[PDB]
Amino acid sequence: MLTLIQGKKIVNHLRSRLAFEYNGQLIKILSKNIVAVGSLRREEKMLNDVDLLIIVPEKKLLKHVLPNIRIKGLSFSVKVCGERKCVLFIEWEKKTYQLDLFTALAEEKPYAIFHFTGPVSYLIRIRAALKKKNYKLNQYGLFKNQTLVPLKITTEKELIKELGFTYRIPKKRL
Numbered sequence: 336m337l338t339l340i341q342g343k344k345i346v347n348h349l350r351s352r353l354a355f356e357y358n359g360q361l362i363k364i365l366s367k368n369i370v371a372v373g374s375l376r377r378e379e380k381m382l383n384d385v386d387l388l389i390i391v392p393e394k395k396l397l398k399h400v401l402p403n404i405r406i407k408g409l410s411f412s413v414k415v416c417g418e419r420k421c422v423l424f425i426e427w428e429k430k431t432y433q434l435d436l437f438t439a440l441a442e443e444k445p446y447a448i449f450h451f452t453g454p455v456s457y458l459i460r461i462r463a464a465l466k467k468k469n470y471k472l473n474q475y476g477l478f479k480n481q482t483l484v485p486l487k488i489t490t491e492k493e494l495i496k497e498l499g500f501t502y503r504i505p506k507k508r509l
């Protein structure tokens with residue numbers, strides 16, 4: 336559906352034109368809080384939908400995006416996915432596209448990004464490996480023998496290094 340260029344230009348527009356309403360007050364939202372994730376990050380020729388990870392330093396402000404969310408001069412629709420995932424649709428220039436958005440906290444920054452960074456297969460492999468190491472990775476933190484422990488990283492590299500693994504390129508899978 337979307338191409339590398341399309342994704343780049345639409346995301347750029349999307350991020351600089353996003354605004355949500357909280358308590359009747361309009362709060363504009365840029366890429367400062369939202370990071371484009373998908374094949375776009377993997378540097379792919381063509382992808383289906385553009386996904387956007389919205390990382391907020393406050394649980395409140397994060398949930399404040401839900402009451403009202405809009406775009407400047409654009410056609411959209413609001414859908415939900417699972418328990419923490421969200422799905423939106425956007426149309427412009429007589430064209431229609433799919434926009435997936437996930438709500439995450441500033442602490443769930445490295446984890447979320449690592450997840451959308453390359454292929455799910457790699458993640459599953461890591462999750463299974465940690466399971467053998469008696470560790471459990473989750474969107475909220477790392478579980479050491481049922482004991483939840485927070486993260487001391489912010490980078491994917493730092494995350495893999497902290498987890499005890501190596502970082503490979505998603506472009507060539509795993």
Ligand SMILES: Nc1nc2c(ncn2[C@H]2C[C@H](O)[C@@H](COP(=O)(O)OP(=O)(O)OP(=O)(O)O)O2)c(=O)[nH]1
Pocket residue numbers: 372373374375381382383384385386387435450451452453454455
């Ligand atoms: N597609 C999708 N992605 C999710 C989900 N949960 C985590 N992710 C992971 C799976 C993929 O490895 C990675 C990329 O997800 P995206 O939703 O951003 O879409 P992307 O553009 O990468 O794939 P696409 O071109 O939209 O089909 O994110 C999910 O339930 N569905």
